[PDB]
Amino acid sequence: KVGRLIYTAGGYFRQSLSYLEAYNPSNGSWLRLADLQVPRSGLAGCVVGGLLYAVGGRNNSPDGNTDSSALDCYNPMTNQWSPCASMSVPRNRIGVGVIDGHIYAVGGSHGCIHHSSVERYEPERDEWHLVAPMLTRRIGVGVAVLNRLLYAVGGFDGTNRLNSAECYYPERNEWRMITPMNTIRSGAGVCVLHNCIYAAGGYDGQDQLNSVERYDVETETWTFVAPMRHHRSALGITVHQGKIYVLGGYDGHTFLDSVECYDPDSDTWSEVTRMTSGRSGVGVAVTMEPC
Numbered sequence: 183k184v185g186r187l188i189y190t191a192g193g194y195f196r197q198s199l200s201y202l203e204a205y206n207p208s209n210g211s212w213l214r215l216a217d218l219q220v221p222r223s224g225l226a227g228c229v230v231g232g233l234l235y236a237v238g239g240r241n242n243s244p245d246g247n248t249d250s251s252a253l254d255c256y257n258p259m260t261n262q263w264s265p266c267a268s269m270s271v272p273r274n275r276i277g278v279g280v281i282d283g284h285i286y287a288v289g290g291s292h293g294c295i296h297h298s299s300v301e302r303y304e305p306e307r308d309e310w311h312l313v314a315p316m317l318t319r320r321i322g323v324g325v326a327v328l329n330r331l332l333y334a335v336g337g338f339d340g341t342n343r344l345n346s347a348e349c350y351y352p353e354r355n356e357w358r359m360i361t362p363m364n365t366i367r368s369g370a371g372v373c374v375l376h377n378c379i380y381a382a383g384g385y386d387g388q389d390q391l392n393s394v395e396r397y398d399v400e401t402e403t404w405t406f407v408a409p410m411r412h413h414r415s416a417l418g419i420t421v422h423q424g425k426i427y428v429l430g431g432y433d434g435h436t437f438l439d440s441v442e443c444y445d446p447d448s449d450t451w452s453e454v455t456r457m458t459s460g461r462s463g464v465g466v467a468v469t470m471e472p473c
Protein backbone atom coordinates (compact mmCIF):
# COMPACT_ATOMS: atom_id res chain seq x y z
CA LYS A 183 0.00 0.00 0.00
CA VAL A 184 2.94 2.36 0.51
CA GLY A 185 4.51 4.50 -2.17
CA ARG A 186 1.41 5.61 -4.10
CA LEU A 187 0.94 9.09 -5.51
CA ILE A 188 -2.00 11.08 -6.84
CA TYR A 189 -1.23 11.87 -10.48
CA THR A 190 -2.83 14.80 -12.28
CA ALA A 191 -2.55 14.93 -16.06
CA GLY A 192 -3.46 17.71 -18.43
CA GLY A 193 -6.06 20.35 -17.71
CA TYR A 194 -6.99 23.86 -18.75
CA PHE A 195 -5.92 27.36 -17.82
CA ARG A 196 -6.17 29.78 -20.79
CA GLN A 197 -5.37 26.80 -23.04
CA SER A 198 -5.12 23.04 -22.65
CA LEU A 199 -2.12 21.85 -20.69
CA SER A 200 0.42 19.03 -20.99
CA TYR A 201 1.41 18.86 -17.31
CA LEU A 202 1.86 15.59 -15.47
CA GLU A 203 2.37 16.22 -11.75
CA ALA A 204 2.17 13.84 -8.81
CA TYR A 205 1.29 14.55 -5.19
CA ASN A 206 2.55 12.44 -2.30
CA PRO A 207 0.00 12.55 0.57
CA SER A 208 2.58 11.08 2.95
CA ASN A 209 4.91 14.10 2.77
CA GLY A 210 3.04 16.89 0.96
CA SER A 211 5.44 17.01 -1.97
CA TRP A 212 4.68 17.53 -5.65
CA LEU A 213 6.77 16.22 -8.52
CA ARG A 214 6.66 17.44 -12.11
CA LEU A 215 6.96 14.46 -14.47
CA ALA A 216 7.06 13.93 -18.22
CA ASP A 217 4.66 16.16 -20.14
CA LEU A 218 1.90 14.61 -22.20
CA GLN A 219 2.77 14.36 -25.88
CA VAL A 220 -0.28 16.50 -26.74
CA PRO A 221 -1.88 19.05 -24.37
CA ARG A 222 -5.40 18.08 -23.38
CA SER A 223 -8.21 19.19 -21.11
CA GLY A 224 -11.44 17.35 -20.46
CA LEU A 225 -9.63 14.02 -20.42
CA ALA A 226 -9.86 11.23 -17.88
CA GLY A 227 -7.15 9.26 -16.13
CA CYS A 228 -7.12 5.70 -14.88
CA VAL A 229 -4.64 3.00 -13.91
CA VAL A 230 -4.38 -0.62 -15.01
CA GLY A 231 -1.45 -2.84 -14.11
CA GLY A 232 0.43 0.03 -12.51
CA LEU A 233 0.35 2.08 -15.72
CA LEU A 234 -1.37 5.45 -15.93
CA TYR A 235 -3.64 6.02 -18.92
CA ALA A 236 -4.80 9.37 -20.30
CA VAL A 237 -8.01 9.04 -22.32
CA GLY A 238 -9.72 11.50 -24.66
CA GLY A 239 -10.06 15.21 -24.05
CA ARG A 240 -9.48 18.19 -26.31
CA ASN A 241 -6.50 20.33 -27.19
CA ASN A 242 -7.65 23.94 -26.92
CA SER A 243 -4.83 26.07 -28.32
CA PRO A 244 -4.55 29.51 -29.91
CA ASP A 245 -4.36 27.72 -33.28
CA GLY A 246 -7.45 25.54 -32.90
CA ASN A 247 -9.50 23.05 -30.92
CA THR A 248 -8.97 19.36 -31.60
CA ASP A 249 -11.03 16.70 -29.83
CA SER A 250 -8.95 13.68 -28.89
CA SER A 251 -9.51 10.00 -29.60
CA ALA A 252 -6.16 9.27 -27.99
CA LEU A 253 -5.19 6.71 -25.40
CA ASP A 254 -1.69 7.22 -24.01
CA CYS A 255 0.12 5.25 -21.32
CA TYR A 256 2.61 6.57 -18.76
CA ASN A 257 5.00 4.13 -17.09
CA PRO A 258 6.29 5.45 -13.74
CA MET A 259 9.27 3.08 -14.02
CA THR A 260 10.55 4.95 -17.09
CA ASN A 261 8.91 8.39 -16.79
CA GLN A 262 7.79 8.01 -20.40
CA TRP A 263 4.50 8.21 -22.27
CA SER A 264 3.71 5.74 -25.06
CA PRO A 265 0.78 5.87 -27.49
CA CYS A 266 -1.82 3.11 -27.43
CA ALA A 267 -4.56 2.29 -29.90
CA SER A 268 -6.96 5.19 -30.41
CA MET A 269 -10.67 5.06 -29.68
CA SER A 270 -13.28 4.83 -32.43
CA VAL A 271 -14.21 8.51 -32.02
CA PRO A 272 -12.91 11.69 -30.36
CA ARG A 273 -14.31 12.17 -26.84
CA ASN A 274 -13.89 15.46 -25.01
CA ARG A 275 -15.38 15.76 -21.52
CA ILE A 276 -15.21 11.97 -21.32
CA GLY A 277 -15.81 9.65 -18.40
CA VAL A 278 -13.75 6.51 -17.78
CA GLY A 279 -13.97 3.48 -15.52
CA VAL A 280 -12.00 0.26 -15.18
CA ILE A 281 -13.60 -3.18 -14.78
CA ASP A 282 -11.40 -6.27 -14.46
CA GLY A 283 -8.44 -4.70 -16.21
CA HIS A 284 -10.43 -3.16 -19.07
CA ILE A 285 -10.91 0.57 -19.66
CA TYR A 286 -14.39 1.81 -20.52
CA ALA A 287 -14.62 5.15 -22.32
CA VAL A 288 -18.05 6.70 -21.92
CA GLY A 289 -19.76 9.54 -23.74
CA GLY A 290 -18.09 12.86 -24.36
CA SER A 291 -18.32 15.31 -27.24
CA HIS A 292 -16.92 15.66 -30.75
CA GLY A 293 -17.70 19.15 -31.98
CA CYS A 294 -21.44 19.58 -31.57
CA ILE A 295 -21.99 15.79 -31.31
CA HIS A 296 -22.88 14.52 -27.81
CA HIS A 297 -22.10 10.82 -27.60
CA SER A 298 -24.12 8.04 -26.05
CA SER A 299 -21.55 5.54 -27.35
CA VAL A 300 -19.28 3.54 -25.08
CA GLU A 301 -16.16 1.50 -25.90
CA ARG A 302 -13.89 -0.89 -24.03
CA TYR A 303 -10.10 -1.22 -24.23
CA GLU A 304 -8.18 -4.47 -23.73
CA PRO A 305 -4.58 -3.67 -22.71
CA GLU A 306 -3.33 -7.19 -23.44
CA ARG A 307 -4.48 -6.91 -27.07
CA ASP A 308 -4.14 -3.10 -27.45
CA GLU A 309 -7.62 -2.99 -28.97
CA TRP A 310 -10.82 -1.02 -28.46
CA HIS A 311 -14.29 -2.34 -29.23
CA LEU A 312 -17.67 -0.64 -28.95
CA VAL A 313 -20.16 -1.97 -26.41
CA ALA A 314 -23.80 -1.04 -25.85
CA PRO A 315 -24.43 2.73 -25.86
CA MET A 316 -25.91 4.54 -22.90
CA LEU A 317 -29.62 5.33 -22.81
CA THR A 318 -28.73 9.06 -22.78
CA ARG A 319 -26.18 11.16 -24.63
CA ARG A 320 -23.82 12.55 -21.99
CA ILE A 321 -20.82 14.88 -22.05
CA GLY A 322 -19.19 16.11 -18.89
CA VAL A 323 -20.30 12.78 -17.45
CA GLY A 324 -18.92 11.34 -14.23
CA VAL A 325 -18.08 7.64 -14.26
CA ALA A 326 -17.14 5.22 -11.53
CA VAL A 327 -17.09 1.48 -10.95
CA LEU A 328 -18.36 -0.36 -7.90
CA ASN A 329 -18.74 -4.12 -7.58
CA ARG A 330 -17.88 -4.61 -11.27
CA LEU A 331 -20.77 -2.39 -12.39
CA LEU A 332 -20.15 0.86 -14.27
CA TYR A 333 -22.06 4.04 -13.46
CA ALA A 334 -22.54 7.10 -15.66
CA VAL A 335 -23.74 10.11 -13.69
CA GLY A 336 -25.07 13.46 -14.83
CA GLY A 337 -23.59 15.41 -17.70
CA PHE A 338 -25.07 17.41 -20.56
CA ASP A 339 -27.01 15.87 -23.45
CA GLY A 340 -26.70 18.76 -25.90
CA THR A 341 -29.80 20.56 -24.63
CA ASN A 342 -30.12 19.98 -20.88
CA ARG A 343 -27.82 19.38 -17.96
CA LEU A 344 -28.73 16.16 -16.26
CA ASN A 345 -29.53 14.79 -12.84
CA SER A 346 -30.08 11.34 -14.36
CA ALA A 347 -27.72 8.42 -13.98
CA GLU A 348 -27.44 4.91 -15.36
CA CYS A 349 -25.60 1.65 -14.75
CA TYR A 350 -23.97 -0.79 -17.17
CA TYR A 351 -24.21 -4.51 -16.44
CA PRO A 352 -21.34 -6.06 -18.42
CA GLU A 353 -22.58 -9.65 -18.53
CA ARG A 354 -25.79 -8.43 -20.20
CA ASN A 355 -24.12 -5.65 -22.23
CA GLU A 356 -27.01 -3.45 -21.08
CA TRP A 357 -27.61 -0.08 -19.46
CA ARG A 358 -30.42 0.69 -17.01
CA MET A 359 -31.43 3.95 -15.39
CA ILE A 360 -30.82 4.31 -11.67
CA THR A 361 -32.39 6.79 -9.26
CA PRO A 362 -31.58 10.33 -10.41
CA MET A 363 -29.45 12.61 -8.29
CA ASN A 364 -31.06 15.34 -6.27
CA THR A 365 -29.07 17.96 -8.19
CA ILE A 366 -28.42 18.53 -11.88
CA ARG A 367 -24.67 18.23 -12.42
CA SER A 368 -22.42 18.53 -15.44
CA GLY A 369 -18.69 18.35 -14.86
CA ALA A 370 -18.94 16.83 -11.39
CA GLY A 371 -16.26 14.66 -9.87
CA VAL A 372 -17.57 11.11 -9.58
CA CYS A 373 -15.85 8.34 -7.65
CA VAL A 374 -16.50 5.32 -5.48
CA LEU A 375 -15.91 5.03 -1.76
CA HIS A 376 -17.10 2.08 0.30
CA ASN A 377 -20.59 1.11 -0.99
CA CYS A 378 -21.46 4.47 -2.57
CA ILE A 379 -20.97 6.45 -5.76
CA TYR A 380 -20.14 10.07 -4.89
CA ALA A 381 -20.90 13.07 -7.10
CA ALA A 382 -19.06 16.19 -5.96
CA GLY A 383 -19.47 19.65 -7.39
CA GLY A 384 -20.23 20.35 -11.01
CA TYR A 385 -22.45 22.89 -12.70
CA ASP A 386 -26.25 22.90 -12.47
CA GLY A 387 -26.89 25.28 -15.38
CA GLN A 388 -26.78 28.34 -13.09
CA ASP A 389 -23.86 27.98 -10.67
CA GLN A 390 -20.82 25.90 -9.85
CA LEU A 391 -21.65 23.63 -6.92
CA ASN A 392 -20.05 22.82 -3.58
CA SER A 393 -22.64 20.18 -2.72
CA VAL A 394 -21.77 16.49 -2.69
CA GLU A 395 -24.20 13.57 -2.78
CA ARG A 396 -23.71 9.82 -2.68
CA TYR A 397 -25.68 6.93 -4.15
CA ASP A 398 -25.90 3.80 -2.02
CA VAL A 399 -25.97 0.97 -4.53
CA GLU A 400 -27.99 -1.26 -2.16
CA THR A 401 -30.69 1.21 -1.06
CA GLU A 402 -30.80 3.13 -4.37
CA THR A 403 -30.95 6.51 -2.63
CA TRP A 404 -28.90 9.68 -3.06
CA THR A 405 -27.93 11.45 0.17
CA PHE A 406 -26.09 14.74 0.58
CA VAL A 407 -22.89 14.70 2.63
CA ALA A 408 -20.87 17.67 3.88
CA PRO A 409 -20.28 20.21 1.10
CA MET A 410 -16.82 21.08 -0.11
CA ARG A 411 -15.27 24.33 1.05
CA HIS A 412 -15.13 25.55 -2.55
CA HIS A 413 -17.68 25.49 -5.29
CA ARG A 414 -16.08 23.78 -8.26
CA SER A 415 -16.91 22.42 -11.66
CA ALA A 416 -14.61 20.51 -14.01
CA LEU A 417 -12.72 19.19 -10.99
CA GLY A 418 -10.46 16.18 -10.81
CA ILE A 419 -11.23 13.47 -8.27
CA THR A 420 -9.82 10.24 -6.93
CA VAL A 421 -9.85 8.07 -3.83
CA HIS A 422 -6.80 7.14 -1.83
CA GLN A 423 -6.62 5.32 1.51
CA GLY A 424 -10.30 5.68 2.21
CA LYS A 425 -10.59 9.40 1.50
CA ILE A 426 -11.79 11.39 -1.51
CA TYR A 427 -9.47 13.99 -3.02
CA VAL A 428 -10.82 16.76 -5.27
CA LEU A 429 -8.36 18.77 -7.36
CA GLY A 430 -8.80 22.12 -8.99
CA GLY A 431 -11.76 23.12 -11.11
CA TYR A 432 -13.47 26.43 -11.73
CA ASP A 433 -15.49 28.30 -9.09
CA GLY A 434 -17.05 30.93 -11.35
CA HIS A 435 -14.20 33.38 -10.75
CA THR A 436 -10.90 31.50 -10.46
CA PHE A 437 -9.29 28.33 -11.76
CA LEU A 438 -8.64 26.72 -8.41
CA ASP A 439 -5.35 25.32 -7.18
CA SER A 440 -6.83 23.88 -3.99
CA VAL A 441 -7.05 20.18 -3.21
CA GLU A 442 -9.62 19.14 -0.61
CA CYS A 443 -9.91 15.76 1.11
CA TYR A 444 -13.10 14.16 2.40
CA ASP A 445 -13.03 11.92 5.46
CA PRO A 446 -16.19 9.77 5.48
CA ASP A 447 -15.82 8.82 9.14
CA SER A 448 -16.16 12.42 10.33
CA ASP A 449 -18.11 13.68 7.29
CA THR A 450 -15.74 16.60 6.88
CA TRP A 451 -13.61 18.14 4.16
CA SER A 452 -10.21 19.72 4.73
CA GLU A 453 -7.80 21.53 2.42
CA VAL A 454 -4.66 19.40 2.20
CA THR A 455 -2.44 20.95 -0.48
CA ARG A 456 -2.44 23.23 -3.48
CA MET A 457 -1.50 22.30 -7.01
CA THR A 458 1.40 24.19 -8.51
CA SER A 459 -1.07 26.28 -10.52
CA GLY A 460 -4.84 26.56 -10.81
CA ARG A 461 -6.50 24.55 -13.55
CA SER A 462 -9.67 22.69 -14.50
CA GLY A 463 -10.46 19.65 -16.59
CA VAL A 464 -7.66 17.38 -15.37
CA GLY A 465 -7.43 13.60 -15.39
CA VAL A 466 -6.51 12.01 -12.07
CA ALA A 467 -5.50 8.54 -10.90
CA VAL A 468 -3.34 6.81 -8.30
CA THR A 469 -0.34 4.58 -8.89
CA MET A 470 3.18 3.93 -7.66
CA GLU A 471 5.75 6.70 -7.44
CA PRO A 472 8.08 7.00 -10.44
CA CYS A 473 11.66 5.90 -11.18
Ligand SMILES: O=C(O)CNC(=O)c1cccc2c1-c1ccccc1C2=O
Pocket residue numbers: 194322338368369370384385390415416432462
Ligand atom coordinates in the same frame (compact mmCIF):
# COMPACT_ATOMS: atom_id res chain seq x y z
O1 LIG B 1 -20.68 22.74 -18.21
C1 LIG B 1 -19.96 22.24 -17.32
O2 LIG B 1 -19.76 21.02 -17.14
C2 LIG B 1 -19.25 23.21 -16.37
N1 LIG B 1 -19.16 24.57 -16.86
C3 LIG B 1 -18.93 25.61 -16.05
O3 LIG B 1 -18.89 25.49 -14.82
C4 LIG B 1 -18.72 26.95 -16.67
C5 LIG B 1 -19.80 27.82 -16.81
C6 LIG B 1 -19.63 29.07 -17.39
C7 LIG B 1 -18.39 29.50 -17.83
C8 LIG B 1 -17.31 28.64 -17.69
C9 LIG B 1 -17.46 27.36 -17.11
C10 LIG B 1 -16.16 26.69 -17.11
C11 LIG B 1 -15.77 25.43 -16.66
C12 LIG B 1 -14.45 25.05 -16.79
C13 LIG B 1 -13.52 25.91 -17.36
C14 LIG B 1 -13.89 27.16 -17.82
C15 LIG B 1 -15.21 27.54 -17.68
C16 LIG B 1 -15.87 28.82 -18.07
O4 LIG B 1 -15.36 29.79 -18.57
